Amino acid sequence: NFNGLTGTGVLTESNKKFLPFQQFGRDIADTTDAVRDPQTLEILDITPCSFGGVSVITPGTNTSNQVAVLYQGVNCTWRVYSTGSNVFQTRAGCLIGAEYVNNSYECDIPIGAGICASYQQSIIAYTMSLGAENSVAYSNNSIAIPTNFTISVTTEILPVSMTKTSV
Amino acid sequence: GKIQDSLSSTPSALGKLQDVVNHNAQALNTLVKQLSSKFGAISSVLNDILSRLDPPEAEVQIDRLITGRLQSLQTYVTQQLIRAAEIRASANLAATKMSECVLGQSKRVDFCGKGYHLMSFPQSAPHGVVFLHVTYVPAQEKNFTTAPAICHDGKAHFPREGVFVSNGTHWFVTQRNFYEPQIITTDNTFVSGNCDVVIGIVNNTVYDP
Amino acid sequence: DCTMYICGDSTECSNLLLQYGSFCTQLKRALTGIAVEQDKNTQEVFAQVKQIYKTPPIKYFGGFNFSQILPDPSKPSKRSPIEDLLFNKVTLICAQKFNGLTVLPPLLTDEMIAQYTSALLAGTITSGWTFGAGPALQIPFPMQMAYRFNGIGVTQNVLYENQKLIANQFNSAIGKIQDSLSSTPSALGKLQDVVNHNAQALNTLVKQLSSKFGAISSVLNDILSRLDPPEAEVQIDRLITGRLQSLQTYVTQQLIRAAEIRASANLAATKMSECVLGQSKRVDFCGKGYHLMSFPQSAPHGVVFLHVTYVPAQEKNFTTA
């Protein structure tokens, strides 16, 4: 608290010009992100305490019991206390309970920003794999003609109605 | 022989209707569970309020209870409205698909199936429908050498329905999408222009009876 | 978030919320549903096939300078310079990131989006429509223009006599559309208005955080300080109900725009299926005039379909029998 109004969040040293009798550098969101020290001519950037946002990545109950947990938007570059196996620092946030491999695999369970996880005898994480990559050669005369001609069937599902009701 | 064992394998197929069914179910569960709620009321039962308290200052709880119930049912009916709109749009698309894929052979690629569409068959479902699209897919291929222009007697000729194919052993013309090695005959090619304006020009002979 | 939006660090407000209960959970399931549905639209608007290709190294493509659509190797974000200029024309992150305005990071990067666009462009340019139906079957490029001309009922000899002029006209058209996208900002408007519309939606949201519901202050902690909880709760319930209905209206506006952009994304995916993977005969659906080609280009939350079409220029009337 400083001179009436209060706030909550971490405090850093500001680096911007302030006027005489300038005390609040409030932005278009009207948040006191910058304040003047009431003792010396010292300037403070105010950035609020970081929230979490917690998600759990786990296969089926019949499958296994090993889990992993993501706290999105957490710059571990911490606040984890009881750590698990390994820590990773996705652009989405801070992830524990899994490890990252140097290869890319199928995105069966997406984590985000190209990161996807799965289960090996362990829970693994990786970058998203685009698929099977091949380039067909092109020439001034190169052409391809199919030889065998097979028949496939596709099944699609489309809704029609819901439960009509009155109250 | 696939599709039956394809449909009984996973519940992901009918899940596209199961989610709608259980979502309506849980919506009704939320509406029937919001009767026991606190809209600023001392108790969530109306006649208990009317019994334990005198009328002329009990309505200051009854009115806020009423407003809470009205807000709940208004949110419910608006969510029903938007679901009805999107399911009506999807059902109109389904009716169009039945009008095109089932009643004919549309040229809309990857719309009446996957690949070159041949057949479509509908099957009903509780508040739903499924389509069986019988399509053609090529299996495997082989590479060949291409030359558009065949100049016989100094005269350019282009194959009409298909292209020239160079087996190396022999040289034929086939159809556009598949192979039918066919000899050069006048009905397969049209004749136009000189022989000094084209790329892929080649020299070959032609048949006449 | 339910609580820290509608409350501060005052658990009595959360207690009154638990008296009311479960209304924010409907908003949570709605926002998660529309988010994953937007992700579904994104993954089935671009990832048509999992068989990813790449371009051949040499460009003998009949004098067709495809450098503007080809992914530039100098830029680390190896995309077309068209898309680079589109990103440059497109114009608020960290300040909103720590106020309960929790933006979800996109599960699909722009790098893989550009990779898919490059792969489908390469597949179209080396195989025509053959990869669209089944396996990729490469074809000569003049064969592709010949079959495109036969698609609109035009014989191929005229193509094989003025393909040089066709190439020059196409290169001039590419240069002029490069200038045209840099000419006016009206082409960027259909995405810029959406972006700033979401921005002003969140802006009036954070303004209605500082909205007075008949109390002394918008903040509740000073109200809890100056008055006992026997007194302040008759204001607190009014403020939390107002914030709740404001959230409900905001979520409603979110979902109706989500449905509109869902229909737009369905139409865009349909046009990708039809105009890009083949030659549709639907007039003006694949662009005005007789459609020949169509290439897509990525954009933040969007895609620009460029269409190469036939128009007739010189004509003459004649006696008809």
Q: Is the CB of B84 inside 8 Å of chain C's CB atoms? A: no
Q: Which residues pair with C309 in a beta bridge?
A: C291
Phi, psi torsion values for A99, nearest 5 degrees: -125, 155
From CA C15, how far away is CA B38, in angstroms rounded? Answer: 11
CA nearest to B140 within chain C: C135
Q: Which of B70, B192, B194, B196 to mutate to test the interface with C (most CBs of C within 10 A)?
A: B192
Map residue A147 onto helix, strand or coil.
strand
Q: Which residues pair with A57 in a beta bridge?
A: A68
Q: Least CB-CB distance to A159: which of B91, B143, B179? A: B91
Q: What is the CA radius of gyration of chain C?
A: 27
Q: Is the CB of A157 inside 8 Å of chain C's CB atoms? A: no
Give the 3-state secondary structure of A47-61.
ECCCCCCEEEECCCC
CA nearest to C50 within chain A: A131
Which residues from chain C sit within 8 angstroms of residue B81, using beta carbons?
none
* A152/B137 touch (CB, cutoff 8 Å), yes or no: yes
Map residue C173 onto helix, strand or coil.
helix
Tokens read off for C11: 């658990």
CA nearest to A50 within chain C: C98
Q: Is the CB of A134 inside 8 Å of chain B's CB atoms? A: no
Q: Are B131 and B101 in contact (CB under 8 A)?
A: yes
Burial class (CB in 10 A: 0-12, 13-18, 19+), C275: buried
C17-40: buried (b, 16+ CB within 10 Å) or exposed (e) per residue?
beebeebbebbeebbeebeeebbe
Strands in chain C per DSSP E: 290-299, 302-310
Map residue C293 onto helix, strand or coil.
strand
User: CA triplet C297, C168, C268: central angle to 5 degrees?
Assistant: 20
Give the closest residue to B16 by CA, choosing from B135, B133, B132, B125: B125
Residues 66-125 of C with CB under 8 A from B: none
Q: What is the CA radius of gyration of chain B?
A: 35
Q: Least CB-CB distance to B40: which of C140, C237, C262? A: C237
* A73/C102 touch (CB, cutoff 8 Å), yes or no: yes
Q: Using alpha carbons, list the distances in angstroms from residue B84 to B24, B89, B163, B195.
A: 12, 9, 52, 65
Q: Are C100 and C113 in contact (CB under 8 A)?
A: no
From CA A56, how far away is CA A66, in angstroms rounded? Answer: 11
- Torsion B183-B184-B190-B195 (CA) sign: positive
* A51/C100 touch (CB, cutoff 8 Å), yes or no: yes
Give the closest residue to C203 by CA, choosing from C105, C301, C95: C95
Q: Is the CB of B70 inside 8 Å of chain A's CB atoms? A: no
Distance from CA of A160 to the nearest CA of C (A): 18
Phi, psi torsion values for B148, nearest 5 degrees: -70, -50
Q: Using alpha carbons, list the distances in angstroms from residue C311 to A130, C288, C291.
A: 39, 9, 9
Phi, psi torsion values for B177, nearest 5 degrees: -105, -20
Per DSSP, helices labelled H in C68-158 are 81-89, 110-127, 130-133, 141-151
- How many CB pairs lie under 8 A apart between chains A and B? 133
Question: CB-side exposure of B156: number of CA atoms within 13 Å?
Answer: 19
From CA B84, how far away is CA C41, in angstroms rounded? Answer: 20
Angle between helices C159-183 and C141-151 (to 10 degrees): 90
From CA B185, how far away is CA B165, in angstroms rounded? Answer: 14
Q: Is the CB of C259 inside 8 Å of chain B's CB atoms? A: yes
Q: Using alpha carbons, list the distances in angstroms from residue C55 to A7, A129, A142, C65, C147.
A: 56, 19, 15, 14, 22
Q: Is the CB of A23 inside 8 Å of chain C's CB atoms? A: no
Q: Is the CB of B97 inside 8 Å of chain A's CB atoms? A: yes
Q: Read out DSSP for chain B?
A: --HHHHHTT-TTTTHHHHHHHHHHHHHHHHHHHTTS--SS-SSS-HHHHHHHS-GGGTHHHHHHHHHHHHHHHHHHHHHHHHHHHHHHHHHHHHHHHIIIIITS----TTTSSSSEEEEEEEEEETTEEEEEEEEEEEEEEEEEE----EEETTEEEEESSSEEEE-SS-EEEE-SSS---B--BGGGEEE-S-SSS-SS-EE---B--
For the CA atoms of B61, B66, B72, B77, the dihedral, rounded to the nearest 10 degrees, stands at 180
- How many CB pairs lie under 8 A apart between chains A and C? 98
Q: Is the CB of C153 inside 8 Å of chain B's CB atoms? A: no
Burial class (CB in 10 A: 0-12, 13-18, 19+), B134: middle
Which residues from chain A sit within 8 angstroms of residue C220, using beta carbons?
none
Which residues from chain A sit within 8 angstroms of residue C55, using beta carbons?
135
Which residues from chain C sit within 8 angstroms of residue B78, using beta carbons?
252
User: CA triplet C265, C268, C272: central angle to 5 degrees?
Assistant: 135
Strands in C1-122 per DSSP E: none
C-alpha C188, offset from chain centre: 12
Q: Using alpha carbons, list the distances in angstroms from residue C22 to B48, C14, C25.
A: 24, 12, 5
* A110/C139 touch (CB, cutoff 8 Å), yes or no: no
- Resolution in Å equals 4.6
Burial class (CB in 10 A: 0-12, 13-18, 19+), B113: buried
Residues 159-188 of B with CB under 8 A from A: 163, 165-166, 174, 177-179
* C26/B30 touch (CB, cutoff 8 Å), yes or no: yes
Q: Are B100 and B108 in contact (CB under 8 A)?
A: yes
From CA B175, how far away is CA B177, in angstroms rounded? Answer: 6
End-to-end CA distance of chain C: 76
* C132/B137 touch (CB, cutoff 8 Å), yes or no: no
| C251 Cβ contact partners less than 8 Å away, ≥ 6 residues apart | C27, C30, C31
Q: Least CB-CB distance to B17: which of A147, A151, A157? A: A157
CA nearest to A49 within chain C: C98
Q: Is the CB of C161 inside 8 Å of chain B's CB atoms? A: yes
Count CB neighbours of C137 within 10 A. 22
* C116/A33 touch (CB, cutoff 8 Å), yes or no: no
From CA B162, how far away is CA A151, in angstroms rounded? Answer: 23
DSSP label at A114? Answer: T
Q: What is the CA radius of gyration of chain A?
A: 27
CA nearest to A93 within chain C: C105
Segment holding A158, helix H or strand E: strand A142-159
Burial class (CB in 10 A: 0-12, 13-18, 19+), B57: exposed
Q: Is the CB of B83 inside 8 Å of chain A's CB atoms? A: yes
Q: Are A117 and A68 in contact (CB under 8 A)?
A: yes
Q: Are B61 and B42 in contact (CB under 8 A)?
A: yes
